[PDB]
């Protein structure tokens, strides 16, 4: 897990530095990150909501 | 510097990225020709403007 | 002005890896395979061209003789060094070797930890993969197999580390012996048509170590002939260590595996010493060796029972058979049955060296040693005993015609009036062709075929003593099928059809063969009789033609004999 | 085995034979050998030496059969083709029921080798076992190469070869002789794993075992320092790094930066290339490039941290590298030096690209541009092909050997072509195939052998020149962007113009063959195209087109006019080149007479051909229109309008233009 | 119930101790380093 985390971190570093590397304190990577967060959370919402929706079909007996 | 370099690095052969210079040149040449032919049309019109007087 | 810089480079290089010390294993491998690149490499070239290595290989006893080099050890270990120094001190305290040799062995083991770890039993996953591949072939040991974690945690322990250090010490001893043996072989019996670099290196090593210059009409063999006692004396310490392990060594390490490894190492060292002695002896074939050395050697063999006490075990047969064969070979060499009979019948002084024939004490010692060996019931003494019996049979008749020093011997042990003991010994040796069978087995283990225990040249030069014994013994015992099959198994060795090549080698290697067509005794008795007994006795003539056609391919002077 | 060896000599005593008879006998022999190889895994021999010799013999026979089939692609290797084909179909895609019966012998051999005790006696058995192991390794390598060839997507033998490498990782520990063959095998397995993520090799080797193997192999033949085992270990390292192996690559490069890693010794060898054998230098540079292109962040970092030792040696090598080294002492070293220079240029270009990405390539590029002398001498110019001696050798071989041709000895690309005397012609086989009759040996080391060796050396030199061409192309392409400011303009423009002139001259001079090397058409035109593009963007040209355009005109005249043929890229790049050239000329009289040839003979002919074909075309017509527009702008035309009215009216282009407009 | 425990343990342990599964990571790392070097180079080139 630790090594995998290290890997992911490095991948993030390479992607972020490659896409932009003359202003790492910029608002773009900011929007990217926050927006990714929102994507993930939205996915969570969608999936779990779908699960609950599925759970209702059981009561439809 | 090395931190950002490793963060923004991509797992791929290096000789392929430098090759992209060829593509970029092929895509710049078009605009360069368009600038040639526009500065040429311009020049022509200018010489006509100096012919009429 | 002979330092150990090239021999023992600074510890900083060995640790950092900038210069891997040329351990004796690599030198032995390069000398055995006769590789051109490795032998001509700068590192090994400088290592061999150094006078320090020459003095060491000319005096192996000094390489392990107990000395007090505390000052040198402290100066080398000063300017992971603590563990290295501790292991070196422990090894120097356990074994009688000097501290410098212990430190060198520890450094070599440190550099060779990868091999020592890879030669260990495999892990469980490896056994599982092998079983999956297999779907006979049961050379594994899954009952004791363990995972890699527990294999590595046990590898870094102290007891296992010391055991590996001792194993590496024994392996390095064997490698040094084999390397010096192969070096002497290549320097004395160098093959022709070799690369210019090899010839130049050989000439340089010779001129630097033994002053043996080929452009001199008479090279200096003194420094090469003085290599026989140097190893005949070390064989004493070898057998002493074989019959008794180090006392200072901890009892926990003295296990069955360690005892077997020590015995095998001692046997290998003794075999290599015997081979080096045989080479240094055959270097000067016609002249006799100093009797002062043969006396001590025969006393040594008498005491040790021809190494049968250490070779008596049944777990060293693979190493005992070749050991016994080489002991018999060196005994027959120092005996010089051919030259001995020539002197007894010619009475002319050779002038090369004084023989043991002028010393009655040496004769008495040899006789009592042969008697003890025959009474002990050992097969290794069959050819040596038979030979000695023949010599006594010629001395008896020499005394009958004169009825001078040998007379003292002949009258000391009551061997003048009666000739019963030697005759009974010869009868027992010839009964059931046991002597011939053991000689054939020795030749097989001392031949050129792939079944031989030594290199092709080693066996080619070792068969000379047996061929001479058969030469001088052929006119005594009549022509018979057993001696013929013996000579056939000797000269041919049982090689295959594809073991014949046109590779030109040194004339020395072809000597053992050409002698069949050089000496009249081996020409009018074996070759002529073999030709006459054809096709009636087909195998002898056939095998003779086969070996002759296989050996005289490049010899244009005798290419049309077959 | 002897029968197969004798049949291999199909260039000849033989009264009473025929191709069909030999083919059938070879097929039967192959079937019998395969049956013996499958049945040997059940017999019980009195000793192991007998089975070892049997396995050695059968493996050597199969290896000699396999190599002989793919070593060449001509009819000479047709007698044993049904046999080699059979053995390959039976050792690459066997049935699933008898798949393990053919693999268990190799596994048992490897087991017996990895658990045989070390002994100083019995050298015969030792050498026999060593030869058996080397034969098994060579056979594995041959099977891997055969599977890589012919387009095999699913190799069932790879699953067993992985578990065999599991043992081959420890096998060298018993004997150092196995260090090179084993590595070769591994290299071939990795190559088959590339053109086919692959099965993780760390799962089969193991952490401890893999680290031990790495610590054993990292030192390249340190106690002796030979060239053969060095090139072998450098090709092995390059192949292991080029593939998707990542754990092993990391453990081999880092060493657990690098303090005891392969690179720590590769730098020690690079800092002495002035005296090191050129043969090993090529392999070292190949390893460096393989570690850079796939793992740049480490190699380039370590080289920058230690550039004080590498840049100086590179500059020394560049300054004292003559161009024409054939005439001086040395004929085969020319190709080696060219390959070394090409690799050095490639590494310099890669590190300059990395620095530019890091914005630290100004000073390094400014210091390196002063070392391009060897490039200006023997770079884009590929005229060192010397087709004269090649044609003479071809004629002499066709006159003495009517049946066998010189092209019949072309390699089938089964093994990576060596940059030596066997780059194209298979000398290792020719030595035993043509040495039966008088003429190959020759007096005083003459005859066809020396000429074939010289031809192979020339081909290797041409390949090294092409590699240097690509490297210098990339280097100059990036430098043109790097050296945008107004400084060192003089030398820069001189070098660019010299490169363009050399390219345009080589485009006219004798061309190399298309079957041996790649077609140069459109390969070296875009180079000068982008060079002139960027130089015009910088506007730093000496308006010296009075002589530069002559070569372009000669090329356009002697190109066979493939306006609409398959060679469309070549025509388009030539048109763009002449466009940029005439534009540079416009920026600058004796020019009008030299540029009216394109307005009279080139533009009109191409326009008429396009109008006739169109009855692809759009872009070509637009390019021709732009060419004419930019060509009518030269100052020398505003006065010769009288003289050009007739040439422009003679072709009646307006009629076809209005027709196409309809 | 020990059998079931060591059964599960053996299953997961067997699943983990595989050549391929263990190899994939190692292959991946180098496979990443390739892109690392390539990207860093292409980045330094277009570092203007």
Give the separation between CA D587 and CA D569, rounded to whole angstroms: 27
Contact criterion met (CB below 8 Å) for D458 and D385: yes
Asked if residue D205 lies in contact with residue D169, where contact means CB atoms within 8 angstroms, the answer is yes
Q: What is the resolution of this structure in A?
A: 23.0
Question: Which of B1, B3, B5, B9 is best to mutate for the A interface (most A CBs within 10 A)?
Answer: B9
> What six digits make up the tokens of D589?
């009289």
Cα C485 from chain centre: 26
Q: Is the peptide bond before D2 cis (omega within 30 degrees of 0)?
A: no
Q: Tokens in use for D507?
A: 């485009």
Q: Which residue of C has its CA nearest to E13?
A: C125
- Contacts of B46 by beta carbon, 8 Å cutoff, 6+ apart: none
Method: cryo-EM
Up-side HSE of residue C189: CA atoms within 13 Å toward CB? Answer: 30
Cβ atoms of residues C48 and C205 within 8 Å: yes
Burial class (CB in 10 A: 0-12, 13-18, 19+), C440: buried
What's the rounded Cα separation, in Å, for the pair D313 and D332?
A: 23
Burial code (b: 16+ CB inside 10 Å, e: under 16) for A1-33 equals: eeeeeeeeebbebbbbbbeebeeeeeeeeeeee
CA distances (Å), origin D535, targets D117, D139, D538, D540: 70, 55, 5, 6
Residues 6+ apart with CB under 8 A from C233: C61
Distances (CA, A) of D63 to D56, D128, D165: 10, 17, 19
Which of B3, B4, B18, B28 is the best substitution to test chain D (most D C-beta atoms within 10 A)?
B18
E16 close to D (CB below 8 A): no
- 3-state DSSP assignment of residue D485: coil
Distance CA D631, CA D623 (A): 12
Separation of CA C339 from chain center: 23
Give the C-alpha separation, C484 to C492, whole Å: 12
> Using CA atoms in the order D630, D635, D638, D642, what is the torsion angle rounded to 10 degrees?
-90
CB contact under 8 A, E46 and D356: yes
CA distance D540 to D494: 11
Give the chain E residue whose CA is nearest to the CA of C126. E19
Residues 6+ apart with CB under 8 A from A31: none
Paired tokens of D15 = 């009264």
* Contact of C184 with C279, CB cutoff 8 Å: yes
Is the N-terminal amide bond of C86 cis, ω within 30° of 0?
no
Interface contact flag, E33 D298, Cβ < 8 Å: yes
Could you tell me if A6 lies within 8 Å of chain B, comparing CB atoms? no
- Token couple for D14: 């033989």
Phi-psi sector, D255: left (phi>0), alpha (psi -120 to 50), beta: left
Is residue C150 within 8 Å of residue C121, measured between CB atoms?
A: no
Alpha-carbon torsion angle B30, B36, B41, B42, nearest 10: 130
CB C291 within 8 A of CB C355: yes
Backbone torsion region of residue D154, taken as left when φ is above 0, otherwise alpha when ψ lies between -120 and 50, otherwise beta: beta
Handedness of CA C65, C66, C67, C69 (dihedral sign): positive
Nearest-angstrom CA–CA distance, D329 and D326: 7
Task: Look at B11 and E40 and tell me if their CB atoms are within 8 Å.
Answer: no
Helix, strand or coil for residue D100? coil
Residue in the block written with tokens 């439809």: A60
Q: How far apart, in whole angstroms, are the C-alpha atoms of residue C170 and residue D255?
A: 31
Residue C411: CB atoms within 10 A of its CB come to 13
Query: What pairs with residue C242 in β-bridges?
Result: none
Contact C158, C252 (CB under 8 A): no
- Tell the residue number behind the tokens 């010397």, with chain if given: D386
Q: In whole angstroms, give the CA distance from residue D103 to residue D94.
A: 11
- Nearest-angstrom CA–CA distance, D375 and D494: 13
Interface residue E47 vs chain A (CB under 8 A): yes
Q: Residues near C522 by Cβ (< 8 Å), separated by ≥ 6?
A: C467, C470, C471, C474, C515, C516
DSSP string, D486-535: SSSHHHHHHHHHHHHHHHHHHHHSPPPPTTTS---TTTSHHHHHHHHHHH
The Cα–Cα gap between C129 and C134 comes to 9
CA distances from D278 to D226, D329, D335, D340 (A): 13, 15, 10, 8
Contact D596, D647 (CB under 8 A): yes
Q: Closest-CA residue in chain E for C129?
A: E19
Distances (CA, A) of A35 to A11, A20, A43, B4, D112: 18, 17, 12, 21, 62
- Indicate yes or no: CB of A13 within 8 angstroms of CB of B10: no
Determine the distance from the C-alpha atom of residue D191 to the mean position of all C-alpha atoms in its chain, rounded to a whole number.
15
- Which residue in this structure is represented by tokens 């060795």? C493
Q: Are B42 and D629 in contact (CB under 8 A)?
A: no
Q: What is the DSSP string of D387-405?
A: HHHHHHHHHHHHHH-SSS-
Distances (CA, A) of D328 to D324, D331, D332, D334, D372: 8, 8, 11, 10, 21
Handedness of CA A25, A31, A34, A39 (dihedral sign): negative
Phi, psi of D358 (to 5 degrees): -95, 0
D226 in C contact zone (CB under 8 Å): yes
**Chain D residue numbers touching C134 (CB-CB < 8 A):** 100, 104, 107
Cα–Cα nearest to D515, from D599, D627, D394 = D394
Report d(CA C201, CA C188) in Å as an integer. Answer: 13
Q: Can you tell me the distance from the alpha carbon of D357 to that of D367, in angstroms, rounded to the nearest whole number?
A: 18
Which pair of tokens denotes residue C25?
Answer: 């294993």
User: CA C58 to CA C56: how far, in whole Å?
Assistant: 5
Cα distances (Å, whole numbers) of residue A21 to C125, D238, D298, D634: 45, 31, 19, 45
Using alpha carbons, list the distances in angstroms from residue C18 to C288, D55, D445. 50, 41, 42
d(CA D336, CA D345): 14
Q: Tokens 């009264």 sit at which residue?
A: D15
DSSP secondary structure of B1-43: -HHHHHHT--SS-HHHHHHHHHHHHHHHHHHHHHHHHHHHHHH
Distance from CA of B11 to the nearest CA of A (A): 9
């Amino acid at each position: 897990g630790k090594d995998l985390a290290k890997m992911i971190k490095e991948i993030n570093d390479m992607s972020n530095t490659l896409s932009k590397g003359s202003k790492p304190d910029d608002p773009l990577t900011q929007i990217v990150r926050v927006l990714n967060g929102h994507l993930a959370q939205l996915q969570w919402i969608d999936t779990n909501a779908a699960a609950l929706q599925a759970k209702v079909a059981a009561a439809q007996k | 510097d090395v931190d950002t370099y490793l963060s923004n690095l991509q797992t791929k052969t290096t000789l392929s990225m430098i090759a992209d210079g060829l593509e970029r040149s092929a895509r710049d040449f078009d605009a360069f020709l368009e600038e040639n032919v526009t500065l040429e049309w311009e020049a022509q019109r200018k010489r006509i403007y100096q012919h009429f007087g | 002005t002979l330092t150990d810089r090239t021999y023992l480079p600074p510890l900083e290089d060995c640790l950092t890896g900038r210069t891997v010390i040329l351990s004796w294993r690599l030198v032995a491998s390069a000398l055995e395979d006769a590789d051109l690149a490795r032998l001509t490499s700068p590192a090994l070239s400088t290592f061999l061209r150094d006078g320090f290595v020459h003095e060491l290989l000319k005096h192996p006893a000094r390489v392990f003789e107990p000395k007090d080099l505390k000052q040198e050890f402290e100066t080398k270990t000063s300017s992971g060094v603590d563990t290295i120094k501790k292991d070196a001190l422990w090894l120097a305290d356990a074994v009688a070797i000097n501290q410098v040799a212990a430190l060198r062995i520890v450094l070599i083991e440190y550099q060779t930890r990868a091999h020592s770890h890879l030669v260990l039993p495999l892990s469980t996953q490896d056994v599982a993969n092998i079983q999956e591949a297999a779907g006979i072939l049961s050379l594994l040991n899954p009952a004791s197999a363990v995972d890699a974690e527990t294999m590595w945690c046990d590898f870094e322990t102290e007891a296992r580390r010391r055991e590996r250090i001792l194993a590496t010490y024994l392996s390095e001893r064997r490698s040094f012996t084999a390397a010096v043996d192969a070096l002497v072989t290549f320097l004395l019996h160098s093959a022709p048509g070799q690369h210019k670099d090899l010839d130049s290196l050989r000439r340089a090593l010779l001129k630097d170590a033994f002053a043996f210059d080929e452009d001199l009409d008479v090279p200096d063999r003194s420094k090469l002939l003085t290599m026989a006692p140097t190893y005949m004396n070390l064989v004493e310490d070898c057998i002493a260590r074989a019959q008794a392990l180090p006392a200072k060594l901890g009892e926990s390490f003295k296990t069955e595996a360690f005892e077997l490894d020590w015995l095998r190492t001692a046997i290998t060292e003794a075999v290599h010493s015997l081979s080096i002695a045989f080479q240094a002896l055959d270097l000067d074939t016609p002249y006799f060796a100093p009797h002062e050395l043969l006396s001590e050697w025969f006393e040594l063999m008498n005491s040790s029972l021809f190494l049968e006490s250490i070779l008596g075990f049944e777990v060293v047969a693979d190493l005992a058979m070749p050991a016994r064969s080489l002991v018999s070979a060196i005994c027959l060499k120092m005996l010089n049955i051919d030259r001995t009979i020539q002197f007894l019948h010619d009475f002319d002084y050779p002038d090369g060296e004084e023989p043991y024939l002028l010393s009655s004490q040496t004769l008495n010692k040899i006789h009592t040693a042969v008697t003890n060996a025959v009474n002990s019931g050992v097969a290794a003494s069959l050819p040596v005993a038979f030979a000695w019996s023949l010599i006594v049979h010629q001395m008896h008749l020499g005394y009958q015609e004169r009825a001078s020093p040998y007379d003292d011997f002949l009258r000391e042990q009551r061997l003048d009036n009666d000739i019963a003991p030697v005759e009974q010994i010869a009868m027992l040796a010839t009964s059931r062709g046991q002597v011939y069978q053991v000689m054939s087995e020795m030749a097989l283990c001392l031949g050129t075929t792939h079944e031989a225990a030594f290199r092709p040249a080693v066996g080619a030069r070792a068969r000379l003593v047996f061929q001479d014994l058969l030469k001088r013994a052929a006119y005594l015992i009549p022509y018979q099928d057993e001696p013929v099959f013996s000579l056939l198994a000797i000269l041919a060795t049982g090689r295959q059809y594809w073991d014949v090549t046109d590779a030109l080698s040194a004339s020395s290697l072809n000597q053992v063969y050409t002698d069949m067509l050089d000496d009249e005794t081996l020409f009018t008795q074996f070759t002529m009789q073999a030709i006459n007994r054809f096709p009636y006795e087909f195998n002898p003539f056939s095998v003779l033609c086969r070996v002759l056609a296989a050996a005289l391919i490049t010899n244009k002077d005798k290419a049309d004999v077959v | 085995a002897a029968l197969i060896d004798s049949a291999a000599c199909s260039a000849v005593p033989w009264l009473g034979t025929s191709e069909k008879i030999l083919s059938r006998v070879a097929l039967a022999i192959a079937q019998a050998a395969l049956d013996v190889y499958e049945s040997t895994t059940t017999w019980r021999f009195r000793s192991e030496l007998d089975r070892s010799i049997l396995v050695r013999d059968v493996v050597g026979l199969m290896h000699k059969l396999v190599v002989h089939a793919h070593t060449l692609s001509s009819h000479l290797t047709s007698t044993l083709s049904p046999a080699a084909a059979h053995i390959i179909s039976s050792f690459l895609t066997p049935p699933p029921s008898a798949s393990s019966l053919r693999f268990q012998p190799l596994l048992g051999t490897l087991l017996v080798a990895l658990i045989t005790p070390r002994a100083t006696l019995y050298p015969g058995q030792s050498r026999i076992l060593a030869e058996r192991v080397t034969s098994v390794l060579a056979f594995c390598t041959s099977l891997l190469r055969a599977a890589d060839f012919l387009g095999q997507t699913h190799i069932p033998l790879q699953t067993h070869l992985f578990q065999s490498a599991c043992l081959l990782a420890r096998l060298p520990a018993a004997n150092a002789v196995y260090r090179a063959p084993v590595l070769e095998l591994l290299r071939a397995l990795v190559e088959v794993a590339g053109r086919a993520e692959p099965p993780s090799l760390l799962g089969y080797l193991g952490s401890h075992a893999a680290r031990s193997f790495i610590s054993l192999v990292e030192g390249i033949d340190k106690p002796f320092g030979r060239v053969e085992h060095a090139v072998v270990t450098w090709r092995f390292f390059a192949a292991v790094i080029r593939n998707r192996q990542q754990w092993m690559a990391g453990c081999l490069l880092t060493g657990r930066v690098g303090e005891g890693s392969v690179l720590a010794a590769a730098m020690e060898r690079l800092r002495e290339v002035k005296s090191l054998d050129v043969q090993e230098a090529v392999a070292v540079m190949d390893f460096v490039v393989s570690a850079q292109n796939y793992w740049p962040w480490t190699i380039f970092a370590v080289r920058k941290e230690k550039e004080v030792v590498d840049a100086l040696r590179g500059y020394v090598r560049g300054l004292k590298a003559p161009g024409m080294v054939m005439k001086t002492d040395g004929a085969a070293a020319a190709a080696f030096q060219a390959r070394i220079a090409a690799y050095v240029a490639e590494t310099f270009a890669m590190q300059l690209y990395h620095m530019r990405q890091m914005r630290q390539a100004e000073k390094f590029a400014g210091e390196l541009v002063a070392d391009l002398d060897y490039f200006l001498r023997e770079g884009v110019m590929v005229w060192g092909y010397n087709a004269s001696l090649h044609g003479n050798f071809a004629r002499n071989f066709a006159k003495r050997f009517p049946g066998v041709e010189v092209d019949d000895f072309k390699r089938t690309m089964w093994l990576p072509r060596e940059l030596g005397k066997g780059y194209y012609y298979a000398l290792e086989v020719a030595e035993q195939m043509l040495g039966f009759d008088a003429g190959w040996g020759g007096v005083k080391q003459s005859g066809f052998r020396k000429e074939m060796e010289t031809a192979n050396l020339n081909l290797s030199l041409v390949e090294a020149q092409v590699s240097l061409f690509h490297a210098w192309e990339y280097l100059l392409l990036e430098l043109t962007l790097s050296l945008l400011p107004k400084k060192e303009n003089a030398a820069f423009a001189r070098q660019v113009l010299q490169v363009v002139e050399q390219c345009l001259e080589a485009n006219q001079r004798s061309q190399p063959p298309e079957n041996i090397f790649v077609v140069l058409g459109h390969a070296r035109a875009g180079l000068a195209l982008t060079l002139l593009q960027r130089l015009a963007d910088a506007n730093q040209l000496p308006r010296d087109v009075t002589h530069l355009l002559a070569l372009v005109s000669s090329a356009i005249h002697a190109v066979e006019n493939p306006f609409g043929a398959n060679d469309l890229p070549y025509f388009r790049t030539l048109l763009k080149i002449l466009f940029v050239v005439l534009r540079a000329a416009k920026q600058g009289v004796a020019i009008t007479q030299q540029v009216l040839t394109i307005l009279d003979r080139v533009v009109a002919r191409c326009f008429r051909a396009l109008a006739a074909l169109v009855h692809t075309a759009p872009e070509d017509l637009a390019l021709i229109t732009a060419i004419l527009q930019a060509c009518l702008s030269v100052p020398g035309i505003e006065q010769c309008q009288v003289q050009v009215l007739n040439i422009m009216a003679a072709h009646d282009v307006f009629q076809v233009a209005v027709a196409l407009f309809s | 119930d020990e059998d079931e425990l060591k059964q599960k343990l053996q299953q997961i342990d067997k699943t983990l101790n595989d050549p391929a599964q263990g190899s994939r990571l190692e292959e991946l790392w180098s496979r990443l380093i390739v892109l690392r070097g390539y990207a860093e180079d292409l980045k330094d080139q277009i570092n203007q």
